[PDB]
Amino acid sequence: ADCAWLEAQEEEEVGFPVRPQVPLRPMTYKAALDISHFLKEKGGLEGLIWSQRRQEILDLWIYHTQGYFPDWQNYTPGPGIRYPLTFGWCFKLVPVEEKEVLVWRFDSKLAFHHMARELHPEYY
Amino acid sequence: CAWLEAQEEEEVGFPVRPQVPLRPMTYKAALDISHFLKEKGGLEGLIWSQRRQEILDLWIYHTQGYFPDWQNYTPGPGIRYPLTFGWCFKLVPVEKEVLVWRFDSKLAFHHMARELHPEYY
Numbered sequence: 634a635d636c637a638w639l640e641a642q643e644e645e646e647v648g649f650p651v652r653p654q655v656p657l658r659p660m661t662y663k664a665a666l667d668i669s670h671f672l673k674e675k676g677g678l679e680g681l682i683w684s685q686r687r688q689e690i691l692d693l694w695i696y697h698t699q700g701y702f703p704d705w706q707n708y709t710p711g712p713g714i715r716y717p718l719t720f721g722w723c724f725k726l727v728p729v730e731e732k733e734v735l736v737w738r739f740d741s742k743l744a745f746h747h748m749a750r751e752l753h754p755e756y757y
Numbered sequence: 758c759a760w761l762e763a764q765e766e767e768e769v770g771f772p773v774r775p776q777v778p779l780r781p782m783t784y785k786a787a788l789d790i791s792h793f794l795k796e797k798g799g800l801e802g803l804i805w806s807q808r809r810q811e812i813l814d815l816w817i818y819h820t821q822g823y824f825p826d827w828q829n830y831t832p833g834p835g836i837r838y839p840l841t842f843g844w845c846f847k848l849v850p851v852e853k854e855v856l857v858w859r860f861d862s863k864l865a866f867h868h869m870a871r872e873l874h875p876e877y878y
């Protein structure tokens with residue numbers, strides 16, 4: 634089922650149901666900063682249990698509204714706290730009580746400290 | 758049912774609440790959306806799935822405010838007919854069988870789901 638989703642969205646990328654209304658960019662620091670702070674104030678990620686599908690609904694909402702390619706929202710590997718690889722995005726996945734139940738949590742410090750970078754230089 | 762519990766939880770109000778106010782699906786709304794999707798969209802020819810229908814349902818729910826409880830079809834086997842009158846897409850088999858979204862403008866004037874299955878009304 635995991636692989637079946639990738640092939641579906643890449644077919645869907647031209648186009649489904651409508652191609653996005655705005656010019657189609659890649660995710661920036663400031664965009665990711667504004668969208669996070671937006672989603673806290675108005676809208677509701679805070680607390681929700683993470684899933685492959687929910688992330689996709691969130692990725693597609695940003696893609697259709699703002700035009701940012703859904704290529705961006707990636708976190709560090711487990712176990713434990715799951716840090717965003719795209720700097721600017723102020724959400725991380727915390728466990729709640731080796732795969733485990735995660736939760737989107739806002740953290741304004743993520744704006745100033747690229748914690749994924751500091752813990753895993755591997756990726757850069 | 759693993760999806761429905763997640764979907765219900767989400768309904769207040771992930772990822773944002775839809776911007777235009779909520780209202781139930783109508784004949785004309787369904788008609789207009791269908792004819793929009795054929796001209797300026799890409800629902801045509803695409804293989805159906807549970808997730809693809811949900812992406813479509815949520816795009817409508819967010820864009821236009823229609824609660825996603827309207828785009829259901831008749832049971833199989835064979836040509837799968839829309840229960841909501843106005844919606845001009847049906848799911849045709851390609852040859853549990855592989856279905857494809859197909860625009861049919863005659864669905865606007867004949868409630869084929871009604872004529873074949875009066876049990877649902």
Ligand SMILES: CCCCCCCCO[C@@H]1O[C@H](CO)[C@@H](O)[C@H](O)[C@H]1O
Binds near residue numbers: 654697776777815
């Ligand atoms: C799976 C999620 C599908 C995408 C849902 C969000 C798409 C909404 O899209 C936006 O809707 C606004 C009104 O709400 C309009 O003003 C914008 O022009 C439009 O881009």
